[PDB]
Design a protein around this nucleic acid. Structure first.
Lengths: 130, 186, 141, 138, 96, 50, 71
RNA sequence: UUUCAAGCCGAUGGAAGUUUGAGGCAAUAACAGGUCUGUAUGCCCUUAACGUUCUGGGCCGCACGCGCGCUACACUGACGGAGCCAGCGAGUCUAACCUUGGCCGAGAGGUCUUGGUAAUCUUGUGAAACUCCGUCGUGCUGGGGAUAGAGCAUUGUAAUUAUUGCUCUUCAACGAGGAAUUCCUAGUAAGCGCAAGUCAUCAGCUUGCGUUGAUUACGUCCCUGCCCUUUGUACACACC
């Protein structure tokens, strides 16, 4: 048991963690070698020592090449994860954020009512996904 | 002459007699034969005919992106593989294969609408070289793509099946196809 | 010999062994927060943990070019269109690495500051380079 | 002294040829060190070609700017060759023209004359590069 | 070195003024490092003749051949003043 | 239009042609020319510029 | 974003807020198509009316929102 | 070889062959070809307004179709570290290009100091393809990347509509495409980077450049355009 709700096992550690919303394909390997286990190693082969090192990084913050790093938060007083954000936390925050500025006329809130892009990326041909 | 300052043509026996007259191992057309490497893997065998025409057909078909810079490593690094495997000169084995993959009589096509008129034309030496290497590389690039095999292992394995004679080989089999339809529709 | 006679990569590895011995050069702890947080396993030559291998590279470049600038030993001189440019505006990841490395090498007596901007390489510097280049060359022959 | 030129694909090979010593200096670093890769047998190529071996014989000091590892190994090579014919002995050196023409023999893109090649783009109208399209007998 | 530079349109006006500095300014008291040529201060470009509109198939090559000579005067003694005698050939832009 | 020297914000009064009113990609070096159009015309008049 | 050294709060709407707030909160949506302003605490309550394109979609401005632009 | 003509075919000499490669040149005329939105301009018009000014929103809409580019479906390789190399062009005249030195700091980001350059310096060897070696091992993956959400700048007023980009995270279509159709003739397409042009500011475009560089014509039967002679005509507002 590492995650909130989910649990990995049996398959290679990179494949086995992909089923988590918060740990993907080229995002599993990030946390894996920070614990200090390899990619070929399967998640059902893990020793207690190896199991402890992986969950410590994964629930608390993740990184890559970060020499400058503060920990400021939202300023709006809903929640405040902002370390690393796993399954049950990423489905909550990202959901109700969209609803708060949709309640008012933010223009990002009205693009959430439409269907069209929120950032506004070259809008003519894109729109078959969003 | 000396190919990568070791192997030459003086330790090589030649099979087809008319290829002695035309294609000379001086430079036109260079009778030193070797190709079959990508990355680092020492497989088994080597072989691909005429190094001048391994700049030619072998390059563009590949299978590789990149042109000559790829090709010169394919040519060079496979020389050592066959040297310790069958204990042969890398040129000698495929001086057998070049005449087997090169037709004597071929067929032209001329397209009169949706009609393929295959009529016979004679070959003789020069075209037999490059059209044979075209036959090797087109079968090799597609066999690297369509099943799990690198261009290293594909080019390598092919040419002893082409040299001795087997229906596993592409190049002797398509040589048969083009040659026998010429002597039929003559 | 000189630094030219020995190869590029393996000189940087060989010099890095002696670099760790000298306790003026410490790790301010930046590259242990990148290679582990990746997936990347790099074995002990490739490894760089980190100020030892990077100091050996930077100091080699003051033999090979020699002229001024901490900035012109940070990125070669101009072209950081690959990876990230930083000239006037406040210095980033690459910045805080190389300002520290030539500061720490100065506290040995490896690099000195020449009066037309920035660094050269001095007496104890090129001793610590090319004497190690000789030892590696004897292992090559 | 005896010097000479010799370029292909843009290069300036400033090849001095001199009696006494036999160290091959390329700019301000030796032969093995400037060109560490694979193709650097080519800069040692027209040296042993003449008959006798080098190091014992003639000193070579080149300067070169312009040209990749593909270009430079021919530029230096071509300049050593073009400076060989212009050299002085006792019989002297002019007929080494014919043996540098016989270097890459019988399909003469030799070492006397240049590789007159400058790789620029790809063409419109048929299929094209260098060596003309469509032939059964090639 | 006292840097004189000349630049003009074409060859015909340029030959006279360049040769005149060797004749007039230079004598014995001046040593120049001498009358050089240099590459042209040119600006070439290939574009299209019709400026955009009908016809992609049309071309026009352009240049501005503005032939420079440097011709530097080394010795900065008395004779560097006598350049004020030559004021001939306008179209030659003299710059010091 | 643009030719009034006091726009509201800094970047409103953009660039325009002298000859025509036209706007659509002018030239920095010559503030005249419709867009591309009088560039090649006024080359054929006298002289050239890059 | 403009926070340090001069945040981009457009001066016309500061004049609007000092008028309309100390009287009575105006229950009709005041149209305010200005996007480029920082929102300030004297704008809380009163219905600001930013345009979108084809439609409008009612503001209720809360004391929790202050820090951002109208975005 | 050909009539012992003109020419072809190959070879020698050389850095270079049959107008050397690429531009520049567009006859006489026709298509009542296109441009009244470049300016010029006949005449028709409209004139408390098919004038002018203020500001927002539109040109980014959409329920489908068509044309042209970009990117991928891969070991054709990806990922990490190290290393070797080109050419064409830009840069205030009083708002330049850029080297340096320290300080905010999750990004896009300049006030100030010092030094070089009017192009000697600088953009550019922190320039890729490529090469070396190791790992992944054919599974929608270590493939591919749209989309979304999450931490900021003493200026460019200012980037919700409508900016690029950087780190974590989200990890789709797609696994080589029917009927059918286009381009690619010997350093000038493919593949590969680099620079200019408009530009306060948004390229995959246009424009210009170098690096690595080849499969294939036997033969004009058929297709489409063009030229010459011969040939039939009742065809003639241009030979709809």
């Amino acid at each position: 048991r590492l995650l909130n709700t989910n649990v990995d096992g049996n398959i290679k550690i990179v494949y086995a963690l992909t089923t988590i919303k918060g740990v993907g394909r080229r995002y599993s390997n990030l946390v894996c070698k920070k614990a200090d286990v390899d990619l070929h190693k399967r998640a059902g082969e893990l020793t207690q020592e190896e199991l402890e090192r992986i969950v410590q990084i994964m629930q608390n913050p993740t990184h890559y090449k970060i020499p400058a790093w503060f920990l400021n938060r939202q300023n709006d007083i809903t929640d405040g994860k902002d370390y690393h954000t796993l399954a049950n936390n990423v489905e909550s925050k990202l959901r109700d954020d969209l609803e708060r500025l949709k309640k008012i006329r933010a223009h990002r809130g009205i693009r959430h009512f439409w269907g069209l892009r929120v950032r506004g990326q070259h809008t003519k041909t894109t729109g078959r996904r969003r | 002459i000396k190919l990568f300052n070791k192997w030459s043509f003086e330790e090589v026996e030649v099979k087809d007699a008319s290829l002695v007259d035309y294609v000379q191992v001086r430079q036109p057309i260079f009778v030193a034969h070797t190709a079959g490497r990508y990355a680092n893997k020492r497989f088994r065998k080597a072989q691909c005919p005429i190094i001048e025409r391994l700049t030619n057909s072998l390059m563009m078909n590949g299978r590789n992106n990149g042109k000559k810079l790829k090709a010169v490593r394919i040519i060079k690094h496979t020389l050592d593989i066959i040297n310790v495997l069958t204990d042969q000169n890398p040129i000698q084995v495929v001086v057998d294969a070049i005449t087997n993959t090169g037709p004597r009589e071929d067929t032209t096509r001329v397209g009169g609408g949706g009609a393929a008129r295959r009529q016979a034309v004679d070959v003789s030496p020069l075209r037999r070289v490059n059209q044979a290497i075209a036959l090797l590389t087109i079968g090799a690039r597609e066999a690297a793509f369509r099943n799990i095999k690198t261009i290293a292992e594909t080019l390598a394995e092919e040419l002893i099946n082409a040299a001795k004679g087997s229906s596993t080989s592409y190049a002797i089999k398509k040589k048969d196809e083009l040659e026998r339809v010429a002597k039929s529709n003559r | 010999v000189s630094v030219r006679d020995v190869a590029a990569q393996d000189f940087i590895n060989a010099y890095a062994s002696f670099l760790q011995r000298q306790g003026k050069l410490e790790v301010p702890g930046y590259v242990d927060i990148v290679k582990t947080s990746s997936g990347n396993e790099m074995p002990p030559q490739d490894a760089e943990g980190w100020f030892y291998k990077r100091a050996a590279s930077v100091a080699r470049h003051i033999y090979m070019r020699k002229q001024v600038g901490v900035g012109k030993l940070n990125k070669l001189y101009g072209g950081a269109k690959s990876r990230g440019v930083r000239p006037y505006k406040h210095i980033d990841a690459s910045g805080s690495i190389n300002r520290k490395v030539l500061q720490a090498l100065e506290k040995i007596g490896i690099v000195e500051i020449s009066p037309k901007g920035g660094r050269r390489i001095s007496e104890n510097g090129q001793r610590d380079l090319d004497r190690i280049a000789a030892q590696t060359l004897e292992e090559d022959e | 002294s005896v010097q000479t030129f010799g370029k292909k694909k843009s290069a300036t090979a400033v090849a001095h040829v001199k009696a006494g010593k036999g160290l091959i200096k390329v700019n301000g670093s030796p032969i093995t060190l400037v060109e560490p890769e694979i193709l650097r047998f080519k800069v040692y190529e027209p040296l042993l070609l003449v008959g006798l071996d080098k190091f014992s014989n003639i000193d070579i000091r080149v300067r070169v700017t312009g040209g990749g590892h593909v270009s430079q190994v021919y530029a230096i090579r071509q300049a050593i060759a073009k400076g060989l014919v212009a050299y002085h002995q006792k019989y002297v050196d002019e007929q080494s023209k014919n043996e540098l023409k016989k270097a890459f023999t019988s399909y003469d893109r030799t070492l006397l004359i240049a590789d007159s090649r400058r790789p620029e783009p790809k063409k419109f109208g048929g299929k094209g590069a260098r060596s003309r399209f469509q032939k059964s007998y090639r | 070195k006292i840097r004189i530079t000349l630049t003009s349109t074409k060859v015909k006006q340029l030959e006279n003024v360049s040769s005149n500095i060797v004749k007039n300014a230079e004598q014995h008291n001046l040593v120049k490092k001498g009358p050089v040529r240099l590459p042209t201060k040119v600006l070439k470009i290939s574009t299209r003749k019709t400026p955009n509109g009908e016809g992609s198939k049309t071309w026009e090559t352009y240049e501005m051949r503005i032939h420079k000579r440097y011709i530097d005067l080394e010795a900065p003694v008395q004779i560097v003043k006598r350049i004020t005698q030559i004021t001939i050939e306008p179209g030659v832009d003299v710059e010091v | 239009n643009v030719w009034f020297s006091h726009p509201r914000r800094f970047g409103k009064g953009s660039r325009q042609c002298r000859v025509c009113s036209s706007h659509t990609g002018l030239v920095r070096k010559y503030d005249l020319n419709i867009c591309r159009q009088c560039f090649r015309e006024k080359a054929n008049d006298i002289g050239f510029h890059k | 974003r403009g926070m340090t050294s001069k945040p981009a709060g457009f001066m016309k709407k500061l004049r609007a807020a000092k008028l309309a707030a100390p009287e009575n909160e105006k229950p009709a949506p005041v149209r305010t198509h200005m996007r480029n302003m920082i929102i300030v605490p004297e704008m809380i309550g009163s219905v600001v009316g930013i345009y979108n394109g084809k439609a409008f979609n009612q503001v209720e401005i809360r004391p929790e929102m202050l820090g951002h632009y109208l975005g």
